[PDB]
């Protein structure tokens, strides 16, 4: 049925988006510069009749007839984006302007992969979509945060001024096969520790909690949101809390490397900074996260074990 | 002495900056696409050896050899998309150029990066409270990210950047049909219309005379201060006092007049200028009365020219 463009389609979330859309029957074109993505992520569809992979940086204009654009082209984990603030800004600015220009020209509906970071260090808990956020416009993260903030602004500008149809997802922390293992976040870190024999190290009693979302739940959110009539931003994330200890335990079992878990009773964890309200997504999209933590960790570990 | 690019050189603040800098013997080039600027604003210099006017949009790359760029090319508030492009593409372009030719770049930012503030007054390490998707975001978010841009080109590429957070400014050449309280009162007084004050006229507005700002910009440009600096006037005056001052300076028989069922909006923001004091030795020095005077003379002249 639909002609669909995915920018960043060779990346973590984008490649799983591709899969789903390729299997629902659509004609998918992937645009990606391979700055962080990888051909292995989409290699299964090369050659297939309805797929096209284009090596292309979104800071360059694109002219293609499509019905829908999922705009995920953007550096995503902190080490990648903080190392190149300028490329990060150019991508979120010039690149969003370009994709919105295409969407306007060809009458595509455009969905933006924004981010809970537009909320900054929140002074409201949890964060709903009303919150304006508390964000340093010139810190070392600002290239991503302000970059994604103004990309949201561009969307509504084109919506208000040129009747572009726009969708805005504010994406919270997400995990699974093909994820990046360098956020030094708790799951990537425990998994690496276990996969190579190391002890899993748990601060204090492992009592701080973390809420992560499994990638296929995200991908369902995105598609649900794209095909809805809600044009204001929608948080997509999983607000279920698991203790850090529980992540150690699950990852230990599922890797099965007989790594030990060990406590540093004098050490400590930071409470998670952001926590998504997703009630608007339940109400307007009928969507919730349905993959249990253990199940997503397993599918993830399965990926990384054989890798 | 210095070769100097001024984008938005032909607008209100820009043309006074041009004035001051020409008078100091620098080589001054103005770039401007005249969306809101006027040649009349710099005709006095057209011809002099040291001056060039170039008609150019900053969303288009530009190559010129200069030592300093004052990047003022932007609508001040108040085409939303063109505003976005201008503050994004435009700033990237000018920082690119500054990279290429080794120029120091001053960004004319705005108190709006603080949004609707939740601390008072606003000093430079306040992060602001800004709606990224509100009716005015394409100005507020565009100037915010313009800042992010300067800092990124500085941290990563060694570009020398300066960032001025400009607060409300008034004076000759300003956009008369502004919306603003001071504007309306000048226009109406000059015409013998009553000056109507909403409520009891006790909401305040703070205003900075243009030559104070221009001084601040130059001081800032030539300092070693790379992080943002508030340039504004913190002195409060009520709307009623504006009305009274303007009525008297104009002398015309306009009468003041309360409309007590009407309300004014409270003053939105108020600069803390400690940092400009300490690190530039700057502060506003033109008293309100004198400034209003110079502003009245201009609107009087300009009513008479258009
Ligand atoms: N994974 C998360 O937790 C998370 C959270 C919030 C938001 N997001 C958003 O999701 C989107 C994807 O992130 P991800 O986790 O899949 O990361 P990712 O890095 O794996 O994917 C991003 C993809 O974009 C491509 N890309 C980057 N810049 C580009 C450019 N200029 N032109 C063309 N392609 C370019 C990369 O090569 C990469 O494949 C991002 O836009 C990110 O901001 C992700
Ligand atoms: N006047 C104030 O109270 C005040 C307050 C806050 C911020 N500022 C900032 O100070 C700067 C100067 O403002 P101003 O009051 O002189 O306004 P202005 O409109 O008089 O000056 C802007 C000038 O820039 C030019 N310009 C606009 N877009 C351009 C483009 N894309 N390419 C080239 N030139 C372009 C306009 O033609 C005009 O000559 C602006 O950046 C504004 O945001 C001023």
- Which residues 213-272 in chain A show a CB within 8 A of chain B? 232-233
Half-sphere exposure of residue A299: CA atoms within 13 angstroms, side-chain side:
15
* Long-range pairs of A87-92 with CB within 8 A, sequence gap ≥ 24: A87/A35, A88/A143, A88/A144, A88/A147, A89/A143, A89/A147, A89/B92, A89/B145, A89/B148, A89/B149, A89/B152, A90/A59, A90/B92, A91/A58, A91/A59, A91/A147, A92/A144, A92/A147, A92/A148, A92/A150, A92/A151
Q: Is B113 on the interface with A (CB under 8 A)?
A: yes
Cα distance between residue A214 and residue A240, in whole Å? 11
Q: Closest residue of B to A157, CA-based?
A: B81
The set of residues, in sequence order, having a beta carbon less than 8 Å from that of B96 and lying 6+ positions away, is: B61
CB B37 within 8 A of CB B10: yes
Residue B280 vs residues A92, A284, B225, B226, B273: alpha-carbon distances, Å: 35, 54, 8, 12, 10
Q: Within 10 A of A70 (CB to CB), how many other CB atoms are there?
A: 30
Cα distance between residue B68 and residue B7, in whole Å? 11
Cβ contacts of A134 on chain B, cutoff 8 Å: 127, 129
Cα distance between residue B250 and residue B191, in whole Å? 10
Helix axis angle, B239-250 to B288-303, nearest 10° = 60
CB A80 within 8 A of CB A180: yes
Helix axis angle, A142-162 to A85-106, nearest 10° = 20
Cα distance between residue A118 and residue A140, in whole Å? 14
**Per-residue tokens: A127:** 């964060």
Q: Within 10 A of B117 (CB to CB), how many other CB atoms are there?
A: 16
Cα distance between residue A38 and residue A180, in whole Å? 11
The set of residues, in sequence order, having a beta carbon less than 8 Å from that of B23 and lying 6+ positions away, is: none
Q: Go through the domains of chain B in sequence order and give each one's CATH number.
A: 1-177+208-234+264-286 (3.40.50.720), 178-207+235-263+287-306 (3.90.25.10)
The set of residues, in sequence order, having a beta carbon less than 8 Å from that of B154 and lying 6+ positions away, is: B160, B161, B226
Cα distance between residue B248 and residue B139, in whole Å? 36
Residues present in chain A in total: 307
CB A146 within 8 A of CB A132: no
Strands (DSSP E) contained in B33-187 are 51-55, 68-71, 104-110, 161-166, 169-170
Size of interface A-B (CB pairs under 8 A): 100
Nearest beta carbon to residue A137 from set B84, B127, B131: B127
Residue A290 vs residues A116, A127, A236, A237: alpha-carbon distances, Å: 20, 21, 13, 11
**Per-residue tokens: A287:** 């969507």
CB A35 within 8 A of CB A59: no
Burial B11-44, CB ≥16 within 10 A → b, else e: bbbbbbbbbebbeeebbbbbbbbeeebeeebbee
* Placement of tokens 């790594």 in the chain: A259
Q: Within 10 A of A113 (CB to CB), how many other CB atoms are there?
A: 26
Cα distance between residue A259 and residue A253, in whole Å? 9
Burial level of A32, CB count in 10 A (0-12/13-18/19+)? buried
Cα distance between residue B98 and residue B154, in whole Å? 11
CB A72 within 8 A of CB A9: yes
CB contact under 8 A, B137 and A160: no
DSSP conformation letters of B171-239: -TTS-SS-S-HHHHHHHHHHTT--EEEETTS-SEE--EEHHHHHHHHHHHHTSS--S-EEES----EEH
CB A178 within 8 A of CB A219: no
Burial level of A159, CB count in 10 A (0-12/13-18/19+)? buried
């Amino acid at each position: 049925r639909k002609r669909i463009l995915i920018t960043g389609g060779a990346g973590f979330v984008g490649s799983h988006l591709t899969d789903k859309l390729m299997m629902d029957g659509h004609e998918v074109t992937v645009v990606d510069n391979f700055f962080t993505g990888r051909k292995r992520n989409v290699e299964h569809w090369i050659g297939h009749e309805n797929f096209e992979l284009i090596n292309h940086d979104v800071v360059e204009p694109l002219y293609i007839e499509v019905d829908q654009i999922y705009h995920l082209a953007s550096p995503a984990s902190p080490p990648n984006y903080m190392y190149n603030p300028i490329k990060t800004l150019k991508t979120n600015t010039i690149g969003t302007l370009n994709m919105l220009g295409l969407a306007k020209r060809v009458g595509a509906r455009l969905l933006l992969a924004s981010t809970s970071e537009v909320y900054g260090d929140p002074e409201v808990h949890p964060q709903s979509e009303d919150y304006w956020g508390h964000v340093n416009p010139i810190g070392p993260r600002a290239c991503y945060d302000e970059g994604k903030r103004v990309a949201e602004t561009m969307c509504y500008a084109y919506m208000k001024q040129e009747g572009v149809e726009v969708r805005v997802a504010r994406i919270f922390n997400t995990f699974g096969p093909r994820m990046h293992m360098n956020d030094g976040r708790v799951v990537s870190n425990f998994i690496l520790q276990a996969l190579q024999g190391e002890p899993l190290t748990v601060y204090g009693s492992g009592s701080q909690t973390r809420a992560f979302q499994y990638v296929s739940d995200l991908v369902n959110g995105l598609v649900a949101l794209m095909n809805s009539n809600v044009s204001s931003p929608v948080n997509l994330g999983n607000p279920e809390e698991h203790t850090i200890l529980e992540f150690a335990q699950l990852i230990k079992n599922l890797v099965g490397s007989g790594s030990e878990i060990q406590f540093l009773s004098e050490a400590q964890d930071d409470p998670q900074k952001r926590k998504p309200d997703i009630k608007k997504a339940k109400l307007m999209l009928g969507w919730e996260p349905v993959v249990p933590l253990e199940e997503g960790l397993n599918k993830a570990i399965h990926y990384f074990r054989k890798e």
